[PDB]
mmCIF file of C-alpha atoms and ligand atoms in Angstrom:
data_model
loop_
_atom_site.group_PDB
_atom_site.id
_atom_site.type_symbol
_atom_site.label_atom_id
_atom_site.label_comp_id
_atom_site.label_asym_id
_atom_site.label_seq_id
_atom_site.Cartn_x
_atom_site.Cartn_y
_atom_site.Cartn_z
ATOM 1 C CA UNK W 1 -8.130 -32.900 9.749
ATOM 2 C CA UNK W 2 -7.682 -31.973 6.094
ATOM 3 C CA UNK W 3 -8.492 -34.374 3.257
ATOM 4 C CA UNK W 4 -9.083 -34.141 -0.481
ATOM 5 C CA UNK W 5 -7.502 -30.720 -0.950
ATOM 6 C CA UNK W 6 -7.351 -29.386 -4.509
ATOM 7 C CA UNK W 7 -5.228 -26.266 -4.141
ATOM 8 C CA UNK W 8 -2.290 -24.832 -6.047
ATOM 9 C CA UNK W 9 -1.628 -21.668 -8.038
ATOM 10 C CA UNK W 10 -5.276 -20.979 -8.868
ATOM 11 C CA UNK W 11 -6.649 -17.413 -9.056
ATOM 12 C CA UNK W 12 -6.903 -15.429 -5.821
ATOM 13 C CA UNK W 13 -9.760 -13.388 -4.358
ATOM 14 C CA UNK W 14 -10.042 -11.094 -1.338
ATOM 15 C CA UNK W 15 -12.677 -12.009 1.231
ATOM 16 C CA UNK W 16 -13.315 -8.374 2.119
ATOM 17 C CA UNK W 17 -13.699 -6.505 -1.170
ATOM 18 C CA UNK W 18 -13.618 -9.224 -3.812
ATOM 19 C CA UNK W 19 -10.543 -8.116 -5.745
ATOM 20 C CA UNK W 20 -8.561 -10.545 -7.901
ATOM 21 C CA UNK W 21 -4.797 -11.042 -7.681
ATOM 22 C CA UNK W 22 -2.131 -13.001 -9.559
ATOM 23 C CA UNK W 23 0.546 -13.104 -6.860
ATOM 24 C CA UNK W 24 0.154 -14.802 -3.479
ATOM 25 C CA UNK W 25 2.051 -12.223 -1.447
ATOM 26 C CA UNK W 26 -0.069 -9.533 -3.084
ATOM 27 C CA UNK W 27 -3.242 -10.961 -1.545
ATOM 28 C CA UNK W 28 -1.589 -11.150 1.875
ATOM 29 C CA UNK W 29 -0.122 -7.640 1.850
ATOM 30 C CA UNK W 30 -3.516 -6.403 0.661
ATOM 31 C CA UNK W 31 -5.380 -8.012 3.561
ATOM 32 C CA UNK W 32 -3.229 -5.837 5.821
ATOM 33 C CA UNK W 33 -4.700 -2.520 4.677
ATOM 34 C CA UNK W 34 -7.981 -4.106 3.591
ATOM 35 C CA UNK W 35 -9.602 -4.157 7.033
ATOM 36 C CA UNK W 36 -12.713 -1.990 6.730
ATOM 37 C CA UNK W 37 -12.954 -2.056 10.524
ATOM 38 C CA UNK W 38 -12.862 0.810 13.007
ATOM 39 C CA UNK W 39 -10.833 1.097 16.229
ATOM 40 C CA UNK W 40 -11.464 -2.151 18.107
ATOM 41 C CA UNK W 41 -10.678 -2.934 21.745
ATOM 42 C CA UNK W 42 -9.829 -6.092 23.664
HETATM 43 ZN ZN1 ZN M 1 -9.551 -6.547 -0.171
#
């Protein structure tokens, strides 16, 4: 139920460390290693 979305090519920011990125894929690939979480189980 989205409505009134103002997105695009605006600056990016990681929700784990707070690093800035210029490329979209960069933020995604970063989230992979950027976990900061130990061995978790089901
Ligand atoms: Zn990060």
